Each structure stands twice: as C-alpha cells, then as structure tokens.
Design a binder for these strands. Structure first.
Lengths: 95, 108, 33, 79, 96, 91, 82, 106, 93
DNA sequence: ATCGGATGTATATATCTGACACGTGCCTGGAGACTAGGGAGTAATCCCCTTGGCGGTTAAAACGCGGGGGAGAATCCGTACGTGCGTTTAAGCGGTGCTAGAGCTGTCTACGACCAATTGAGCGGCCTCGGCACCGGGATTCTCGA
DNA sequence: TCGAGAATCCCGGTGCCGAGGCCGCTCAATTGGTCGTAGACAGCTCTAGCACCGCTTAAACGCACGTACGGATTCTCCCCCGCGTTTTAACCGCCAAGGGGATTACTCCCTAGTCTCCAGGCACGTGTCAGATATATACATCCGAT
C-alpha cells in the first residue's frame, strides 16, 4: 500500500481521443507503460550527451529537438518535430 | 494557490510537471530549461497516439473491442518505421507475423 | 486524411502521417529463374 | 538430464513457428547446446544483479535488466 | 493418408497464428534451477522471473530458426542442418 | 594464382585502397544534398574513408562465407543481400 | 554542382577491397551492388554528422562530428580523438 | 613534505585525483565515495599494461623497436578476451588478420 | 591546455618493456581506449546505483560493474588488482 | 614423380631525414586541515509468497512401420571471368594567394534554482455488469485417388 | 475433371471474472517572490579551407584469348514424414510451514564545501637516430615438357 506511478491514465485519455469505442487490457497497458519509459530514457540520455559535448550545463528545447532528430526515423521525426514546436509555441503565449 | 496545470496551457494530455520532475532527478544535466518538458511530453504523446491508432485498427479487424498484446505486435511489425524503432525489443505474449517463404509454397 | 478524428477542437487527422510505409520482407531463393 | 526435458516435439513446434518445413535428425542436439549457452549467459548477469542487492531471491527486474544490458529489451514484465 | 509436407504447412500456419508458449513449463523450470546451481547455491526464484526467462528463450530460438531457414534455402535445399545454424550464428556475430 | 598472390599482398599491408580525391568529391556531393554551403576539415574526410573501407572489407568477408556455404567460389549479389539481411541491416 | 561521382569508385578499387577480404573470384554484377551499399552507408553517417554540426551553429564539419556519428551507430573508431 | 600524491599511497601510476575529478564532474551520481577512483584507476592501469605488453611482443616479432597501430591491431585481434571486449571497434591504420579459407587453398 | 593519459601510458610501457618506444598515432589509439573504458564502467556503475535507490558510487558498485563488463579471466585479474590497490590505500592514512 | 627455368621472394649495406624523446618555465589544479549534516548501516517486527507434498486425469511423449521424395553423386556443356599488353587519363605533388569563419575576451540581462503556503490531481480500495471464452450443430472449402 | 472425406468457418447459447467507474484523502505540483550566474552578443585576430596552375607518371581502360567453373540433367538410396498403440509425467486442486522481503526508528561517520599553498604536468625548443629507400644478390615456387 505505497504510491507507485505509471502512465496509465494518460494513455487511456489518448486512446479515447483516437478510438472512442475501444478498450484495453492490463497486459497491453503494461506494454505501453514500458514503451513510454524506454523512449523517455533514450531521448533524455541523448540530450544529456549533446549538452556535455558542447560544454553547456542546461537542457533546453533545442537539445530535445536535436535528439529527436537523431533518434527517430525520417517521417516520424518530421511529424514529432512539428508536434513539439506547436506545443511550445502554444505554451509560451499562454499565462 | 493552484490555478491551471501546465498541460492545459500547452494543450496536451501528458503531464508536463511530472516529466519536469523526472528530468530534474535523473542525473541528466545541472539545470533544466522551461520548454524541455513541454516539448518532450508532446513528442511522447504523439508516439503513443500513433501506436494506439494502428493497434485499434488491428483489433477492430478481428471483431474485438479490446486491445491485447497481439494487436500491439501486429501494429508494430507491419510498419517500416515503427519496426525500425523497436527492432531490438521483444513484446511478451505477442507472437510473430505470419509469413512463409514463397519457395516452400506449392504453385498451381 | 482519415486517420484519427479527434484532438480537442482539432483532430488527430492533420497530425498522424497518412501514408505509412509497409514493411517489406526478404525472399531468398527468388523463384524468378 | 534436465536438458532432455526440451523434447523433440517441442523443438519441432519451435521450428514450425519459425516457418521451417523439414528438419534434419541432428538438429535437436545443436538446439539444446545453443539454448544452454544462452541461458548461462543471461542467468550469470541476473545472479550478479541479485547478489549486489544482498538478496537471496531472483526477481523479475534482475532478468529484465540482464536482458536489457545485452540488447534484448523485453516489454511486459517491466512493472 | 496426406502426402508428406502438407501437415507441415498446416502446423506452420497454426503455430504462426497463436501466441502461447510451446515448451512445457515444469521441465524448463528444472533446467533453469540446475543451471543457476553453479553460480550460487541455494537460490530462490520469483515465478515471474522464470516466466520472463521462458519468454526470452522462446523469442530467441524462433528468430534463430528464421535465419537458419534462410541459410538452408540459399543453398537450394528445404531441410535445415546444423551447419546452417552455425553459419547463421557466425554471420550474426556470435560464433566468433 | 595471381588472385592468391593479391590476397596475401593486400592482407599484409595497411594502406588505404581508394583514391582520395574521388572519395572527397562524393562526400561533398552527398553533404550538399543534405545542407548547402558546407566545409570540411581534411581529417573529417580521412575518418570517413577509414570507416568506409573497414565496413566494406567486413561485408566482403561475410559475403565470402555465404558463397562458400552454397558450394561456389564466385561471390554474387545474392550473397551480399543474404549477409546484409542476416546481419540485421536490411530487415 | 557535382554528379555521377559514384563512378569515381572504380572497378579495380572494389577488386582491391575484395582481395583484402579474402575473395578469390568475383562476378560481374558486384560493382553496382557495392556502389549502392556504400552510398547508403555514407548517407546515414553524413546525415548524423551534419545534424551534430548544425546543432553547434557551425559551418564546417569537424572530425569530432564524424567520430560522434560513428559512435552513435555502433561503429566506434579509434585514432581521431575522442 | 606533505605532498604525497594519492596515487603514491595507492601504489599506482595512473592518476587518482584526476579520475576523482572526472567522476565528480561527469554527472554520474550525486555523491562519490573514497575508494571508487582508486579502484577504477587500478583497473584501467591493469588493462593498459595487458594490451601494451602484447603489443610490444608483436613489435619484437617484426624486428621493430616502436609500436605502430598495426601492432595494436595484431595484439588485439589474436587474443579472444580482448577481441570480445573490443568486438565492435575500428582501429585506424590497422589492417586485418591474414586468414584464407581452406577451400580456397590449392 | 588539453589533457590526456599519455605520460601514464608511457610509464606503464617502460614498466613492461624497458626498451620499447611508441609512435604518436598509437598513443592516440591508447588514449581513446582508456577514455572508452572509463565511460563504459562509470555509466554501468551509475545505472547500478540508480537501480537500488542510492546516491553514492562506492568501490562495491565499481566492482560489480567490472564483473558485468569484462569477460572471463580479465574480470578476475582486474578484481584482484583493484582490491589490492584499495586495501593498500586504506593501509596508509 | 622429375628437371629448366623464369619469375617473385627474402637476404645484405649506404645515406638521410624528420619525428620522437628529453630538458626548462610556470601556473593552475590537487593536497592538507577543518566543520557540518544527512545518507546509510543496524536491529526488530510483520506477513507474504516461495518451497514441498499428495492424489487423480488425461493429454502429450515415445515407439514402430511403411513409403516416397529429397539429398547426394556423376556427367556434360558453354560462357563468363582471369591474365596480359598497349594506349589514354587523371590523380598526386609543389607553389601562390585569398578570404571565411573558428576561437577567444569582455558586458550584461533574463532565466532557472530555491523556499514557503495552498490545494486539487492521482492513487488505492470496492463493486458490478458485459465482453470474451467455451460448446455444440450446421454449411463451406480444400486434398487427393481414380 | 470429379466426388469421398477430412478440415475449416459461422451461429447461437451459457456463464464468469476482469475492465471501468466511484469515492476518500494525502502529497506533489502550482503561485509568488528573491537572487545570482550562464549564455547571448559584439568585436577582434589569425588559421586553415578553398581555388588555380603546371608537370609527371602510375593507375585506369579497352581488347583478345582460353579455360575452368556454374548450371542443368539423370540416377540411386536412405532418412524423414504421416499414422496407429502404448506409456508416462505434466497439470490441477488443495493443504501446510517458514524464510526472506519490506518497513520503521536510531545513530554516527563519511563526504561536500572552504581556504591556503605548492608542485606536477602542459607548452615550447632542440638534438640525434630509427626507419625508409636505394642497390645488388640469393633462394623458393610454379608451370611446362617428360
């Protein structure tokens, strides 16, 4: 009986956005949780190495963008860059 | 006070604050900017939406209304770029794609 | 453009790539004589 | 023994899932040798991870980490 | 009586459609315990640990058999032989 | 005979085997296709050459193994494609 | 500005590369395959190197960019720094 | 007096203070112990000595008194442990190992 | 100022082969090798420390990382060398 | 199995040059000495989940038999590749000149760490109903001998 | 080509157990404000990357000849597949004991920070000798004629 966190509720929100009449089992959600953790770690590690190569001490959106370009294959990378840029632009104009 | 989440400002469904905390505690750099968690959460949400859309189509093809790991394997392995991203990853209880070499199959 | 049809006021149609590439399989001993 | 529990019909089924049509008679010994080598390689790292934490029980996460460090990431047991 | 090779194709399709585990659980568990006997004596295993080991082993063997099949076909045969396994493991980067 | 002599001669030495200037031109062409108005340090082109010869030599060893497996002495494109598929570069 | 430079990788050079690999007899179709394979390899490495260069807001590609690009893909190279 | 280096107390040649600095500044963990740089420096020096004496033997068999990259390649590729450790590493100006398959010999 | 491991490698070379020199290219190769192994071992030790929810890297993490990375007899000999160094270091001050 | 004999290979010595190895400043990074606080070792308790045993069922494994088709050899044909010679081309070396642009130093602000107060988001526990599994009967569809 | 007949697909009925909501409630994320330094930016210098010209000579290119290797065909025999019988051990339900894994409260000692000082390890010069290259010679090796 100790708090342990996971990405379940957010994955379910996205799923209701994409397919409004579909469910998911427990093991599939476990797979999805592991997938999100793995990708997060890859991107963050690449950004860390990028910052250390260029002698910086800050991880910015620029580092994440370059790491996303390095990691994902072509068309996925293009669309992911579009999504991230759109989100940052929308966030920085809102209070 | 607590007025508005950051994910509501960015128009996302993933947690910006939790991603910021995870970045700040994971020994990645000395300092972490303000737009890094937003950008990262947007990317993660995009990838999740892609996989879930393909898997939901695969589940609907089989007269089912609930996704199991077999549908995830079918979705991932039938796409060039997703199969390249997960090329060294095993999905438990997933099986394989049906394929038989053409030489083995009888002709006419 | 018919992949995903909801994301807030927008949809998930303009975001997801519309023509993903199918994965091609290597065939040895091509029966092409 | 205990490597003879990997019976001939089981190896035959594993070959069928991989798309094989005809199996020579000397395949089963090679398969048993390969499987034993793979298992030793993984279990050594799992036990190392166990001993570092001063435990006497091998958990799922030791197996997951041992597989991950050999470039064989496994999804499903990670939580 | 079916001609040789037909039931082989039926079994190929049947086992490529399903997702279960093909090795008996109890003999695999005994083999894992005996192998782990060498590195440290008097160990204990969570059940999910043994299940994870089984999943990894099945996946590895199936992929190896796919590469073996390609090597066998390349030499104008349909029967797989130990030397196909040896070539696949050598090129894949494991024999040497 | 002369083939075996060439094998021994080129396995004993360590120099590079492709002329430098054509390789430099090819590298500049591809980088042009990625980004315009780029410049290169000379050691960058030298590193690219070293890596490329290493890759091609290892690939040819795998191809030779594949050809011998099929009871031939001549290497053929099918052998290269099989080796690249088993290596995991293709699928 | 540049074109058909892939034909600057001549047939004798490919023969020499095969000889260092131990190949005794060569077909006549190997040369086109070798050119295609080399072009693909070069494209991947150069794309990574240019990404690394453009992140640092430079205009010349350095040796360290190539070294990092090779390291990222599992082709670690010794002798040019790093 | 009062200037004995940490390497001198450990009985090593590789630098312990420098390795401690690199561990502290490399963002590996929040804190770093006291015996970690010592133990790491000892391991690094051992590996260096192993590879260097193999390379020196390769150099004397060639009747040369200097070590060149070809000698390092020959030392590494002939030993199975080092060939496992450095299995995916390219050494510049190193060449290959002279091997011809037996079906090719006359 | 740019630092390297050149003088330490030269000292070890004079230890094992008293009458052998080394060229500059081979010294660059050796420097790259030392850096590569340093990064590998330190990263594995960091992962070990993070798995068990600790905040310190000690000699025990380095020992386990060495046993995970190096193959065969190399792991045994390296463990012996490092243990000898640590006990000698704690003996003096 | 045994000779010409022509070719390519491992044997000296001469000389010559540039790279390696060592010697001198100096300056900045590491060692000495000391203080403060939290990370980690240690004992104690709870209880969960791992190991072990027993009896019955029944599905899988093991064994034998017959036959066919696939691996292997042996033979023959022709065309693609290797070897060598003469002719054409472009790489490589040496030198001259001209800027882009990398690399460094000095200022200044805007941006992220940090701390205290506030509160709602997300996690654990409890229920319930419907999606999926299983079973039985009936039309389709694919092999295969005749 | 065509019907036995064996396997596969579809419809309907029954039940159960896990996915999806609901509800407390704590603790992590949000607000608001302070402060210090990390990058952004501007200017300056000087290195090294790019462009051009000339000459030489070794590599690339085209062509001809012939042989040996890849492929196709045919024959034989043996070993792997399909199927029926008999044996065995895996799976399942149930029960029982206790060994370690979590969790908590205490205590101390090991590691950041902070000054101060001094010596080790980079840059910069400089000399000399190992290795490369030339030149001539001796010996293995491979191919043709027996």
């Amino acid at each position: 009986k100790t708090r342990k966190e996971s990405y379940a509720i957010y994955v379910y929100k996205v799923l209701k956005q994409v397919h409004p009449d579909t469910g998911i089992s427990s093991k599939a959600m476990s797979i999805m949780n592991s997938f999100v953790n793995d990708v997060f770690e890859r991107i963050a590690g690449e950004a860390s190495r990028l910052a250390h190569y260029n002698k910086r001490s800050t991880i910015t959106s620029r580092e994440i963008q370059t790491a996303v370009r390095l990691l994902l294959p072509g068309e996925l990378a293009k669309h992911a860059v579009s999504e991230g840029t759109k989100a940052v632009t929308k966030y920085t104009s809102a209070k | 006070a607590k007025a508005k989440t950051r994910s509501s400002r960015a128009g996302l469904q993933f947690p910006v604050g939790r991603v910021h905390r995870l970045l700040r505690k994971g020994n990645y750099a000395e300092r972490v900017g303000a737009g890094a968690p937003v950008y990262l959460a947007a990317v993660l949400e995009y990838l999740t939406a892609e996989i879930l859309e393909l898997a939901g189509n695969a589940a609907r093809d089989n007269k089912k209304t609930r996704i199991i790991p077999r549908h995830l394997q079918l979705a991932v392995r039938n796409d060039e770029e997703l199969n390249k991203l997960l090329g060294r990853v095993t999905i438990a209880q997933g099986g394989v794609l049906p394929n038989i070499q053409s030489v083995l199959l009888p002709k006419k | 453009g018919s992949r995903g049809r909801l994301r807030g006021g927008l949809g998930w149609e303009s975001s997801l790539r519309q023509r993903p590439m199918p994965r091609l399989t290597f065939q040895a001993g091509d029966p092409y004589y | 023994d205990n490597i003879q529990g990997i019976t001939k019909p089981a190896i035959r089924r594993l070959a069928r899932r991989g798309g094989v049509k005809r199996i020579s008679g000397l395949i089963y010994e090679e398969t048993r040798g390969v499987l034993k080598v793979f298992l030793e390689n993984v279990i050594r790292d799992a036990v190392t991870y166990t001993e570092h934490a001063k435990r006497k029980t091998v958990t799922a996460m030791d197996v997951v980490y041992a597989l991950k460090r050999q470039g064989r990431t496994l999804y499903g047991f990670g939580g | 009586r079916y001609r040789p090779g037909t039931v082989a194709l039926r079994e190929i399709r049947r086992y490529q459609k399903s997702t279960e585990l093909l090795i008996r659980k109890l003999p695999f568990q005994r083999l894992v315990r005996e192998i782990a006997q060498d590195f440290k004596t008097d160990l204990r295993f969570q059940s999910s640990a043994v299940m994870a080991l089984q999943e990894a082993s099945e996946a590895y063997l199936v992929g190896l058999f796919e590469d073996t099949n390609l090597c066998a076909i390349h030499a104008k045969r349909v029967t797989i032989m130990p030397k196909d396994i040896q070539l696949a493991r050598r090129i894949r980067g494991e024999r040497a």
